[PDB]
Structure 1
Amino acid sequence: TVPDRDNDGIPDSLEVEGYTVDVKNKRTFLSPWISNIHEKKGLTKYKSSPEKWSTASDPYSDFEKVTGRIDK
């Protein structure tokens, strides 16, 4: 099982190196950054801290912020 220290639902390697969020058919996929694919699709590249549940110390996760599972 993949390591995830802060328990924010996103692994530590992706937080240190870079990730993005991408709906594909009607389902949301969280995926590592690939320069050949996600650049031309207009996708933003996120980095965050693998040991903080909320990198800005506000009460919303990194996962909820990048995904949309947040107070609208």
Structure 2
Amino acid sequence: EDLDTDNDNIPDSYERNGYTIKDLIAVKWEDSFAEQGYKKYVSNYLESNTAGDPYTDYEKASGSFDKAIKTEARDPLVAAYPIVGVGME
């Protein structure tokens, strides 16, 4: 309902069932939201960083991190992580 355990801005049941971010707040997910371009997010309600990256579930879902991070890292289940490598010429 409104209980928060991992102490982010997303309640327990919202993460357990499904939520989306609009106007910088978390709301329950409804299937009619998809055709507006919204996305369905599920996270871990006992952890503040589900993926393990420095950014928390709220920051990732609401896109409050560095704006250069790819949009496919916004869902909490995908980690924001670089794969930098070196090649010789």
Give your verdict on TM over 0.5.
yes
Cα contact 2:9–2:26 (8 A) shared by 1: no
* Residues 1:56 and 2:64 are matched in the alignment: no
Partner residue in 2 for 1:2: 2
> Percent same amino acid at aligned positions?
42
Partner residue in 2 for 1:13: 13
**Structure 1 residue 3: Cα displacement:** 0.7
Partner residue in 2 for 1:45: 40
**Structure 1 residue 40: Cα displacement:** 1.5
Please give the alpha-carbon distance, in whole angstroms, between the structure 2 residues aligned to 1:2 and 1:30: 11
Q: The residue matched to 1:15 in structure 2 has which SS?
A: helix
TM-score, normalised to structure 2, is 0.67
**Structure 1 residue 29: Cα displacement:** 3.6
Q: Could you say which structure has the greater relative contact order, defined with CA pairs below 8 angstroms and 6 or more residues apart?
A: 1
**Structure 1 residue 34: Cα displacement:** 0.8
Write out the 4+ residue segments of structure 1 that deviate beyond 6 Å after TM superposition. none
* Residues 1:30 and 2:26 are matched in the alignment: yes
TM-score, normalised to structure 1, is 0.81
In terms of fraction of residues, the more helix-rich structure is 2
User: 1:6-65: CA deviations, max 9, x gaps?
Assistant: 00111010000000112xxxx434211011x20221211000100110100111100001
> Which amino acid is the alignment partner of residue 32 of structure 1?
K
CA RMSD of aligned residues (A): 1.6
Partner residue in 1 for 2:73: none
Partner residue in 1 for 2:79: none
Q: The residue matched to 1:65 in structure 2 has which SS?
A: helix
